[PDB]
Design a binder for this molecule. Structure first.
Ligand SMILES: Nc1c(C(=O)O)ccc(Cl)c1O
Ligand SMILES: Nc1c(C(=O)O)ccc(Cl)c1O
Ligand SMILES: [Fe+2]
Ligand SMILES: [Fe+2]
Ligand SMILES: [Fe+2]
Ligand SMILES: [Fe+2]
Lengths: 170, 170
């Protein structure tokens, strides 16, 4: 049993509540597994969209959240009300908004193999064009993402929309 | 959204309770997805052991169950008490026992790629030797498993232990 014995999930979540809020936001349950199993808390809003080459499973255990999506070339929104489950197909662009403190969402993903890249994207509030995209070989979510977001926020040119000139707020 | 919108999980389980009991036992949530997401009810006991080449995720939503394992060359048991989660590493032999009516376990697995086979095994109650093993390219759990189990139960030679001569009960 390389990942240990069964354990009570509500108590695990209770015990890690202080990581389930800014600034950490989320905590991985088991390390170095093929299934990446995370609990995500809140509050947290964000402007980036995720392009995951594989499926994502959501089970909104506590509180309510929602996903900003690009569904059919249009800005759409999928609500994760408390008790909801959801399977997200590969490559659907999604931007999770988690407004509530104390919320908890079970999120299950797959380790990406070598050369299968994730994308992180920003779109213009005024004209809906892609403003900036970066692709990454994601090895640890908490380690390799913050500097990416930061370099976007720090660069006016990276936030400048190539279509209408509006500088994304970051 | 090829797999539909988010939906309430407790209500889904309630609605499918009549499939969550003999003879069906279990119901897949979404079809033709990479993540195979199933809810398993009860009662059900069984004698076969599963050799899954990939990881298995368990979240025991309702009631209690347990897994007979072969952990370190010894018969062992992992309890799934109500509220427990658990990640099973690849190739750990497991035989789920689900004694309680009305229980519900969320089980998440991966679609096996071509040429990655599952194994189903029986061991002798008297000497612990492998009695019989079959490997299968598992494409649909409910379709390709019952005839396998049945052909084991129907054959005295298949149930005859090659080490001590005892005929497995089936
Ligand atoms: N969808 C998420 C979320 C989320 O939904 O907020 C947090 C962390 C990770 Cl790794 C995700 O894939
Ligand atoms: N572990 C299981 C179970 C179980 O735990 O009873 C039922 C169906 C499937 Cl497809 C599984 O992988
Ligand atoms: Fe994601
Ligand atoms: Fe623009
Ligand atoms: Fe299994
Ligand atoms: Fe034997």
């Amino acid at each position: 049993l390389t990942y240990g014995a069964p354990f009570n999930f509500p108590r695990w979540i209770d015990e890690h509540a202080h990581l389930l809020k800014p600034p950490v936001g989320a905590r991985q349950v088991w390390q170095d597994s093929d299934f990446i199993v995370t609990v995500v808390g809140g509050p947290n809003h964000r402007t980036d969209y995720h392009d995951d080459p594989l499926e994502e499973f959501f089970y909104q255990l506590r509180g309510n959240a929602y996903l900003n999506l690009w569904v059919d070339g249009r800005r759409e929104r999928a609500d994760l009300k408390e008790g909801d489950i959801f399977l997200l197909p590969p490559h659907v662009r999604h931007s999770p908004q988690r407004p509530e403190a104390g919320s908890a969402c079970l999120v299950i993903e797959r380790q990406r193999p070598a050369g299968m890249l994730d994308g992180f994207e920003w779109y213009c509030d005024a004209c809906g064009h892609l403003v900036h995209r970066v692709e990454v070989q994601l090895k640890s979510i908490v380690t390799d993402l913050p500097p990416l977001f930061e370099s976007f926020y720090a660069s006016e040119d990276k936030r400048r929309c190539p279509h209408c000139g509006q500088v994304h707020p970051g």
